[PDB]
Amino acid sequence: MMEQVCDVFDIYAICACCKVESKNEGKKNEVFNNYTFRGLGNKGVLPWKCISLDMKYFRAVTTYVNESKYEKLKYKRCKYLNKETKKLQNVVVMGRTNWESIPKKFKPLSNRINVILSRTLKKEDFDEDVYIINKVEDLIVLLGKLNYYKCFILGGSVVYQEFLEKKLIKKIYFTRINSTYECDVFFPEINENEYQIISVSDVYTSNNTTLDFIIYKKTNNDDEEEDDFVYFNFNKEKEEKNKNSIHPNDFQIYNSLKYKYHPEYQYLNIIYDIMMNGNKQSDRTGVGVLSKFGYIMKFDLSQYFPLLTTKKLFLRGIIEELLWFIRGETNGNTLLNKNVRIWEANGTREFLDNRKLFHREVNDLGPIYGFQWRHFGAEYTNMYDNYENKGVDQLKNIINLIKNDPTSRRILLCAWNVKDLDQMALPPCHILCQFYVFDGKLSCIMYQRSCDLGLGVPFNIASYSIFTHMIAQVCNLQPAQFIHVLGNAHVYNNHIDSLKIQLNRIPYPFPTLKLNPDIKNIEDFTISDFTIQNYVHHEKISMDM
Amino acid sequence: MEQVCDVFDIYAICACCKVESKNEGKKNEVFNNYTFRGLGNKGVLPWKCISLDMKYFRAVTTYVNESKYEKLKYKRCKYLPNSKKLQNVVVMGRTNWESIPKKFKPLSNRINVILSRTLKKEDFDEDVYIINKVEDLIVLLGKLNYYKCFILGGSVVYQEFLEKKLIKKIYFTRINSTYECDVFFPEINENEYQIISVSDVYTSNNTTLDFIIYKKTNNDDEEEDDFVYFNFNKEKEEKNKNSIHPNDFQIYNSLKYKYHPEYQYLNIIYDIMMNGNKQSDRTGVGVLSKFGYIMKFDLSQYFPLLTTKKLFLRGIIEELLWFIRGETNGNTLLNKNVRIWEANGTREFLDNRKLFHREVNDLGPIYGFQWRHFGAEYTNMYDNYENKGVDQLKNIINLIKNDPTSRRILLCAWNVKDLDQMALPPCHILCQFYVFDGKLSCIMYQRSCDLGLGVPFNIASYSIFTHMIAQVCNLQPAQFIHVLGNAHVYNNHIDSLKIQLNRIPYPFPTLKLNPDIKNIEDFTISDFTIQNYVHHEKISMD
Numbered sequence A: 001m002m003e004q005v006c007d008v009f010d011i012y013a014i015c016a017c018c019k020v021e022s023k024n025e026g027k028k029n030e031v032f033n034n035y036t037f038r039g040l041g042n043k044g045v046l047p048w049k050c051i052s053l054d055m056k057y058f059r060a061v062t063t064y065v066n067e068s069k070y071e072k073l074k075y076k077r078c079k080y081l082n083k084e085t086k087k088l089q090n091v092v093v094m095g096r097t098n099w100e101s102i103p104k105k106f107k108p109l110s111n112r113i114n115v116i117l118s119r120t121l122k123k124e125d126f127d128e129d130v131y132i133i134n135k136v137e138d139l140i141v142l143l144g145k146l147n148y149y150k151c152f153i154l155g156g157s158v159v160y161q162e163f164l165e166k167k168l169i170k171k172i173y174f175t176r177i178n179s180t181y182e183c184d185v186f187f188p189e190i191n192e193n194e195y196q197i198i199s200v201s202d203v204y205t206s207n208n209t210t211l212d213f214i215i216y217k218k219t220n221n222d223d224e225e226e227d228d229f230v231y232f233n234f235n236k237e238k239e240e241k242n243k244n245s246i247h248p249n250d251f252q253i254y255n256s257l258k259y260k261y262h263p264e265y266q267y268l269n270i271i272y273d274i275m276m277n278g279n280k281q282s283d284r285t286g287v288g289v290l291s292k293f294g295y296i297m298k299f300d301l302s303q304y305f306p307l308l309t310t311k312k313l314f315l316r317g318i319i320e321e322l323l324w325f326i327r328g329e330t331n332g333n334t335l336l337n338k339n340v341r342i343w344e345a346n347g348t349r350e351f352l353d354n355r356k357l358f359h360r361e362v363n364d365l366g367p368i369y370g371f372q373w374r375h376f377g378a379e380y381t382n383m384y385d386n387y388e389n390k391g392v393d394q395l396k397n398i399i400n401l402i403k404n405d406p407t408s409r410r411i412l413l414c415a416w417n418v419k420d421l422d423q424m425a426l427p428p429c430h431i432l433c434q435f436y437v438f439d440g441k442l443s444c445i446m447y448q449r450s451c452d453l454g455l456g457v458p459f460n461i462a463s464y465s466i467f468t469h470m471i472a473q474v475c476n477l478q479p480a481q482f483i484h485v486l487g488n489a490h491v492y493n494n495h496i497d498s499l500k501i502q503l504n505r506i507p508y509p510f511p512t513l514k515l516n517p518d519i520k521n522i523e524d525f526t527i528s529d530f531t532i533q534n535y536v537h538h539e540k541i542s543m544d545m
Numbered sequence B: 001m002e003q004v005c006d007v008f009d010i011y012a013i014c015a016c017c018k019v020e021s022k023n024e025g026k027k028n029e030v031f032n033n034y035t036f037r038g039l040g041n042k043g044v045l046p047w048k049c050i051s052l053d054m055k056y057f058r059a060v061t062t063y064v065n066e067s068k069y070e071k072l073k074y075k076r077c078k079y080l081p082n083s084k085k086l087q088n089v090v091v092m093g094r095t096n097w098e099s100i101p102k103k104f105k106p107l108s109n110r111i112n113v114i115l116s117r118t119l120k121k122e123d124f125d126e127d128v129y130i131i132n133k134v135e136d137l138i139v140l141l142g143k144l145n146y147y148k149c150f151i152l153g154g155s156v157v158y159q160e161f162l163e164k165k166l167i168k169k170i171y172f173t174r175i176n177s178t179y180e181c182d183v184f185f186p187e188i189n190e191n192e193y194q195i196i197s198v199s200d201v202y203t204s205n206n207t208t209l210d211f212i213i214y215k216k217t218n219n220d221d222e223e224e225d226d227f228v229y230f231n232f233n234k235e236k237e238e239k240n241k242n243s244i245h246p247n248d249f250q251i252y253n254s255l256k257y258k259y260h261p262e263y264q265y266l267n268i269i270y271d272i273m274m275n276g277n278k279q280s281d282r283t284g285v286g287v288l289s290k291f292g293y294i295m296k297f298d299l300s301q302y303f304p305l306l307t308t309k310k311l312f313l314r315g316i317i318e319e320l321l322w323f324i325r326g327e328t329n330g331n332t333l334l335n336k337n338v339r340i341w342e343a344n345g346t347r348e349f350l351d352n353r354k355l356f357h358r359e360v361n362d363l364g365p366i367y368g369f370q371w372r373h374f375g376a377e378y379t380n381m382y383d384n385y386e387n388k389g390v391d392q393l394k395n396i397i398n399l400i401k402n403d404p405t406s407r408r409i410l411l412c413a414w415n416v417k418d419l420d421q422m423a424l425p426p427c428h429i430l431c432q433f434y435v436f437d438g439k440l441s442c443i444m445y446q447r448s449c450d451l452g453l454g455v456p457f458n459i460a461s462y463s464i465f466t467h468m469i470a471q472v473c474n475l476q477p478a479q480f481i482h483v484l485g486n487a488h489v490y491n492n493h494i495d496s497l498k499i500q501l502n503r504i505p506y507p508f509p510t511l512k513l514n515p516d517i518k519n520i521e522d523f524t525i526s527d528f529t530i531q532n533y534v535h536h537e538k539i540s541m542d
């Protein structure tokens, strides 16, 4: 009915939060909620030294104005005050402490109307072109007399709190710094019943830390080439002809989001597309699946490590497997003895017998990945044989091509050995890896013939990202893009419920990957040379239930 | 100041097909936008029925956006109760009116109007208006409540409405098939009207077609700023890359909507020219390259034979039949005058590959061999490999017929053990097939792609191959998915591609296979026919 202050005057809040230094309740499996990011400052200044990307975003946002949109805002505000009818600027409001924490050479903030809240100080105490007020109410009166686009609360713990309590914030531009720092001041705890995240930005790395930008929003407790657009969609099928019996509320949150730019959405959007338009098919098992054919995902390893955050994932296993491949092993016992059971089910007497591998020893997986990577072509005997210098050593070959013929368009690693397929516990899901080198950067494409979106893919994305880092390092290059190509992409029916829950979880800024820098050979890597940092994630999910 | 067509929104909507050359003039045919002009024949439409165009016709003429009518009203009277429903005015010639079935008459949800000098208002409804001449229309439009005015016209109506510069936009449907006609839509003056949009290509009632738009040449709010914010770190541009001038792509960038499938190919080229990386190559020519692209063609709606330049197919079909037989002898192709593999079989090239003991044109264990004898020991192109190695081609055909849901239906030409013995490693790594509801789809991964010369043929080769497999499996072709690894453009092709990107695609042709061929091994060069292939003139990339 009657407009609210924050809407007429367009008062927004903008901030940057990191992870507080809670000693620990045990870094041993800690819960993560949005409240995880709340570190505002320490000892009167910022907890972190410098994060230029946040500064850049901060300046970009608080200074942008759209001239052509002001006229409409003028009417809004005047009409509200019952009032009939320099370059346009935004207004920034900051508490005294916050103001004093900013280096002289930056004050007053350029191209913005600075406003300062304070009691202890008055106009006489400032030499700068700045407005002083001692009552939040005073700011409202002021906005009514100024010509401005939008009003941002640059904050201060105190300032943020009262503005949220007085419910004067329309939106919260929140920067999530994904690293921990000592802090003495914190951002208020946002009430999800008052505010809900509506947009999540891409993830980036700046000054040794990943970070992203999300937007909280207050919740209710030419024109011709536009008609032509409508025309071209004249054949788009109607509604109630989508493909499956998926309910609306099933993805309430997921669809509430305006901008889903976080990389994890490349994966999540595929899960969604399959659930909405997938094809009903039976499979090698009997569970049945929803499937689509042909997808592609790209991850910028230079800005982050794509370890899904909408659910917990462990990497010790997939790393041991990767190391296991590199060694050219095919002995399933080697993994089991490290308590990794990725290949256990495919090495049992039963499994092997079903594959007509009657004379194969339990856990003797046959000429799979490892063997094909180091000995493609060699006649396979048993997992205990010495295959030294037999078969093509593909791994060695691609690492040499990356080093001495980087522009080669023949740097491929193929595990699909048509001749040995049958002798394998099962044909490889990851067919090949093609490498690309430019300006000292390594990118990698991996084609997957079969993809289990629910359980497999999340691990696959991680595996080949780590492998890219590995190949890149021993080749003296920086990892670039990991492009994942899916062939038969399917979601198992007994997974549909967990994934519905997953698509309604908002992603956290990705973590990072650190390899021991001393390892100069693809072969000398060991489990302790790998370290995942700042992995903020949602609660673990059991797909099968 | 003001121009009538801008105030009253007078548009033209039509559908034209191709007209018989009338057996006169037998040379190598040339095409142009005027190729599509057939309007009608014997008071009726040149064709039996094309429901899709019908659906487009109705949808366009009946569409109305009431929330935008006010602005129009403002503009109209500022120039100059009774309809709970705002509608559009459709002006049609007498003949055209008569030719319309009675059951549909007084075009539902459209303020009907007729041009005639014989029809007397009396014998007509109060609704169905009628006029004495062109100029009289403007008057009725000023005294009415309508959204937009569409000229369903007739050859005469169209002609005049154009000479009198009254048309703003033309919604032209391009019917890609030939019929006999007696009346034809006037030739559009490129200096006055130009295409700004091209739609996706479709197949309706046994013919392909697309929708294009001609434009008269002139010669909420909060998540909006949020969008801008999210671009704060946008490549901080304003610095040209790869030295590619603005106007080099005037026509290409002038288009608003490019939904034609061909743009999937054209856009990749554009992307490589604007952002490709400069690299040297095993040829010393240099290229611009990017890594990882994907294209998708709905084989059920058209055959993706590029139209922005002429492409011949006899060669690539022979190469395909050559693969299916499992041959590795380049002489077979050269004797049919298909020189696709000629350079790869010369003494020099073979010697450069360190294949000093290989006969000229003996390409080694390439595609053919790998498809029917993977794993067999390659000796020479004349040896008998009958039943040696794995016959993958046969296995996937069986997998498609007896285990359609299998996720192991792949044909792989990249045999790591035999790579060095090949005149050269396969560019087309593999093919994966997918089956659902009696439809067949194919994904082909290409490790190296010469966007300028090779990709165009590549797209066609595997599209045809998908058709071939589907048929011998009693399935209908669906999608052909092309995954590009290293995608590059040769520097000496750039100027040619600059010319190409500025050409506007024609609706795609169609591929017809001899229905009698029931086994992959039984196809012959005559079992393939490309129909209705309208294309631009040839271009020599070099």
Ligand SMILES: NC(=O)C1=CN([C@@H]2O[C@H](COP(=O)(O)OP(=O)(O)OC[C@H]3O[C@@H](n4cnc5c(N)ncnc54)[C@H](OP(=O)(O)O)[C@@H]3O)[C@@H](O)[C@H]2O)C=CC1
Residues within 6 Å of the ligand: A014, A015, A016, A017, A039, A040, A041, A042, A043, A044, A045, A046, A094, A095, A096, A097, A098, A099, A101, A117, A118, A119, A120, A121, A133, A134, A135, A136, A154, A155, A156, A157, A158, A159, A160, A162, A185
């Ligand atoms: N990471 C981020 O994005 C941000 C971090 N910060 C950090 O926060 C810390 C500062 O926060 P904090 O200590 O809470 O200080 P604030 O910046 O909130 O300043 C509090 C002071 O502002 C004044 N004030 C607040 N409300 C009113 C009012 N209604 N009327 C009159 N005066 C008012 C008073 O000044 P007086 O004493 O004169 O009466 C008050 O003591 C710093 O370390 C700074 O670096 C700040 C902004 C953003």
Ligand SMILES: NC(=O)C1=CN([C@@H]2O[C@H](COP(=O)(O)OP(=O)(O)OC[C@H]3O[C@@H](n4cnc5c(N)ncnc54)[C@H](OP(=O)(O)O)[C@@H]3O)[C@@H](O)[C@H]2O)C=CC1
Residues within 6 Å of the ligand: B013, B014, B015, B016, B038, B039, B040, B041, B042, B043, B044, B045, B092, B093, B094, B095, B096, B097, B099, B115, B116, B117, B118, B119, B131, B132, B133, B134, B152, B153, B154, B155, B156, B157, B158, B160, B183
């Ligand atoms: N493919 C397509 O999109 C279309 C195809 N067609 C086809 O075209 C053929 C009909 O075309 P065509 O012969 O041009 O017929 P039209 O439908 O244009 O009708 C022409 C008649 O309209 C009247 N007329 C024309 N100009 C004027 C004017 N200035 N003032 C008053 N009346 C005027 C005359 O009627 P009068 O005799 O009373 O003076 C005239 O003979 C048919 O076969 C039809 O199927 C028609 C429309 C679209």
Ligand SMILES: COc1ccc(OC)c(CNc2ccc3nc(N)nc(N)c3c2Cl)c1
Residues within 6 Å of the ligand: A014, A015, A016, A045, A046, A054, A055, A058, A098, A101, A102, A103, A106, A109, A153, A154, A155, A175
């Ligand atoms: C030019 O402005 C400055 C220069 C240096 C600074 O460090 C002490 C500061 C501190 N303020 C500062 C720094 C970063 C910020 N980042 C965000 N996302 N939001 C803020 N609201 C904000 C603020 Cl207030 C500002």
Ligand SMILES: COc1ccc(OC)c(CNc2ccc3nc(N)nc(N)c3c2Cl)c1
Residues within 6 Å of the ligand: B013, B014, B015, B045, B053, B054, B057, B096, B099, B100, B101, B104, B151, B152, B153, B173
């Ligand atoms: C329901 O309306 C109709 C049913 C059948 C018709 O032709 C016999 C017609 C009239 N002819 C007709 C048919 C198709 C058309 N299609 C387009 N893109 N533009 C036209 N201007 C047009 C026209 Cl005039 C209308």
Ligand SMILES: O=c1ccn([C@H]2C[C@H](O)[C@@H](COP(=O)(O)O)O2)c(=O)[nH]1
Residues within 6 Å of the ligand: A284, A426, A427, A429, A450, A451, A452, A453, A455, A456, A457, A460, B406, B407, B408
């Ligand atoms: O790293 C892996 C390993 C396996 N799978 C899945 C794919 C299939 O769901 C199943 C193997 O069945 P086939 O595709 O081979 O039929 O395992 C993955 O998604 N990722």
Ligand SMILES: O=c1ccn([C@H]2C[C@H](O)[C@@H](COP(=O)(O)O)O2)c(=O)[nH]1
Residues within 6 Å of the ligand: A409, A410, B282, B424, B425, B427, B448, B449, B450, B451, B453, B454, B455, B457, B458
């Ligand atoms: O059907 C074909 C055959 C070849 N090529 C191109 C790709 C490369 O430009 C060149 C092969 O050289 P390498 O990439 O292998 O170096 O031939 C195509 O684009 N399409």
